[PDB]
Write a protein that binds this ligand. Structure first.
Ligand SMILES: CC(C)(COP(=O)(O)OP(=O)(O)OC[C@H]1O[C@@H](n2cnc3c(N)ncnc32)[C@H](O)[C@@H]1OP(=O)(O)O)[C@@H](O)C(=O)NCCC(=O)NCCS
Ligand SMILES: CC(C)(COP(=O)(O)OP(=O)(O)OC[C@H]1O[C@@H](n2cnc3c(N)ncnc32)[C@H](O)[C@@H]1OP(=O)(O)O)[C@@H](O)C(=O)NCCC(=O)NCCS
Lengths: 376, 376
């Protein structure tokens, strides 16, 4: 009777940028090539990011039409909203349609909708827009999770667990849709942490169907959501902040963000897995939000993870970059697809128990304990 | 085993405005006294609003320091954010402290926090700020409900029901905190619907403790949350919209908003109460979001409600105005207090079953079915 993931799909905007080409493109389109040292610093950030490509619905053409978006602090929120508020549900609809097709049931059986984005707020919200675009029932029970940043891919699983398990027959559609329209901006030699965001953030959407008590004749379980926790890390106030301003969403990142997450992550593992009798962190499958490669590297080092535990998470980071809440859902899709292709015994890389982590502002750690499903 | 409201408290900023004096004050502080006809129109709106007073943390002094807030469309989002993002959790903390005192248990027993506001978004959110201000456990499970407008006082009860009932031992703190900092603006003879907002919107916060399985030795039930639904009204797209812009939160209201809600409300009553065997809408106690007096008047007329059914809802509207999500929680507090004072048989005006309605963008109707508790 646990909430069960029944289908997962993803979508990205067509427009792609090769990370190796990005420092030249970025410093040219923002008219900052005279910033020779800052460009080389950005080059190092992009090289160290461990990202091969990123999708961005923002094109050279759109940026030329909105030049204040290319300044560091140009007045541009209205322009960003005009673009993003249409894009967020549109990209989410692409992912949702594919998830519903995989699931194979009529959309009239979707009783709940969770929509999640940090790319722009509006009233009514992206949940309303998606409900109308998909033609969901007017009576769909909606939860709109706005502006919760990079841990929210786990938040929506924590939410979906309680919705589906407390409501017999319920089926929840989850949609996360994120993009760089509010955060893209030109460079500043007094805002290096803003450059880090320019090296990492990307567009993407993911959609899931979740329900308790699957009908084995028509539905196929992929993961079970066993537990979901959330905690704030000690002494971490101010380490990640994002402010919605006249210049868009400004991003503020302290250098010891990776150290906070790696220094505290084992406590979440202990609290989540000791009650189950589990203590070997290499004996569980891992989905870790790739907020940056340094978070994943330092967690790996601190815990002594074998070097392939984080392969699925690093693969999504490499092929898609930091798509905020969407990343962990992309990673679940990657792992179950790869396990089916490679003939593994379970959707969790042949292991039975797994952990999914969201990392973001607070500092907040979201810890979800999963069970895999056998692949017969 | 139903989610049960165990404590309710409210808070308002000290600064109060008498509605009879507001047209003169408003047209003076916005430098618009030459708008003689528009001022009289605003006078009629304030007279017809059925509001006696409103609380607003915004003072003449603060508005003088932020003159772009007094224009109709002056660039002012940064100024509004600077004020509102501090005020929202501060006013919420005042209500939360009082609710926790009423409840009487240690704040370490609060396992979940729902924070709700449409007065300003930030990362981390007001839930984070409140957790630190109150000293809740770092492991409190937080849900941040941003920008869902006037139906969200019911949304948080719908959310709290599933959180508490799916988690044994859980106790949820709900805080709604709303204010006029993002919406206050000067008048425009081409934006009459914006004037309607200036006549109606107000500041306030409410806080509740909710939990299933109350401990009768230490806790006192006030209401049980039996069911919670949400629906979009047919052909209503665009009737209420709110946009987060460089000039703040702009408000857009069609004239037939009251007709949409009154024409469709009985369907929600039918769906919610027919399965319980209830059809007499005068036989249940009522909590109705006072989005404007015309909504309450037209619902009353359409359904044939006796003229005192909406007394508690109209009382809160009169003494506090439209505080968005906080209103329905103020009304629950008023009704249980009044019923205790007047010696009624139940916290629901002596009736056993009750309905609580949230109204807002979509158009969305939130329908919560309540049970009262006997007063011995
Ligand atoms: C950004 C990142 C990929 C850079 O990788 P790295 O080069 O191996 O790490 P380094 O310490 O060598 O950083 C290289 C340079 O960027 C600077 N830098 C990195 N993070 C920075 C930050 N948050 N603020 C300011 N400068 C920063 C470093 O100081 C260094 O500058 P310098 O060589 O001129 O002295 C890596 O630091 C990372 O993944 N950080 C976590 C990112 C994060 O916070 N994600 C959450 C976003 S919501
Ligand atoms: C605003 C309100 C109190 C006015 O009460 P009322 O005077 O009895 O109703 P009226 O139709 O006579 O309105 C008076 C005037 O305001 C105008 N008006 C009212 N609502 C308006 C709107 N949404 N847009 C533009 N004008 C509006 C009317 O046209 C009328 O102007 P006029 O006399 O010069 O022709 C009442 O209409 C109400 O409660 N409306 C619902 C408010 C609402 O939408 N709340 C949700 C906010 S999120």
């Amino acid at each position: 009777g646990l909430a069960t993931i029944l289908a997962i799909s993803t979508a990205t905007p067509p427009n792609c940028v090769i990370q190796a080409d990005y420092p030249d493109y970025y410093f040219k389109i923002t008219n900052s090539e005279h910033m020779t040292e800052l460009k080389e610093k950005f080059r190092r950030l992009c090289e160290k990011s461990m990202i091969r490509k990123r999708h961005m619905c923002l094109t050279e053409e759109i940026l030329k039409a909105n030049p204040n978006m290319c300044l560091h602090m140009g007045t541009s929120l209205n322009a960003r909203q005009d673009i993003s508020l249409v894009e967020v549900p549109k990209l989410g609809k692409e992912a949702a349609t594919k998830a519903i097709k995989e699931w194979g049931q009529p959309k009239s059986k979707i009783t709940h909708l969770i929509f999640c984005t940090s790319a722009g707020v509006d009233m009514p919200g992206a949940d309303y827009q998606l409900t109308r675009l998909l033609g969901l029932s007017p009576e769909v029970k909606r939860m709109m999770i706005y502006q919760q940043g990079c841990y929210a891919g786990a938040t929506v699983l924590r939410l979906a667990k309680d919705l589906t398990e407390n409501n017999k027959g319920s089926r929840v559609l989850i949609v996360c849709s994120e993009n760089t329209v509010p955060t893209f901006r030109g460079p500043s030699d007094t805002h290096i942490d803003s450059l880090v965001g320019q090296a990492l953030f990307a567009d993407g959407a993911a959609a899931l169907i979740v329900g308790a008590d699957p009908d084995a004749s028509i539905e196929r379980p992929l993961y079970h959501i066993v537990s979901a926790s959330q905690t704030l890390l000690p002494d971490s106030d101010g380490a990640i902040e994002g402010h919605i301003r006249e210049a868009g969403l400004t991003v503020h990142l302290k250098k010891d963000v990776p150290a906070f997450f790696s220094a505290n992550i084992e406590k979440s593992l202990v609290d989540a897995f000791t009650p189950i009798g589990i203590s070997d962190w290499n004996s569980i499958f891992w989905i870790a939000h790739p907020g940056g490669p340094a978070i994943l590297d330092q967690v790996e080092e601190k815990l002594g993870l074998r070097k392939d535990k984080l392969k699925a998470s690093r693969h999504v980071m490499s092929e898609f970059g930091n798509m905020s809440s969407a990343c962990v859902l992309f990673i679940l899709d990657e792992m179950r697809k790869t396990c089916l292709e490679e003939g593994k015994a379970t959707t969790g890389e042949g292991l039975d128990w797994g952990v999914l982590f969201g990392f973001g502002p607070g500092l907040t750690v979201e810890t979800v304990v999963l069970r895999s499903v056998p692949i017969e």
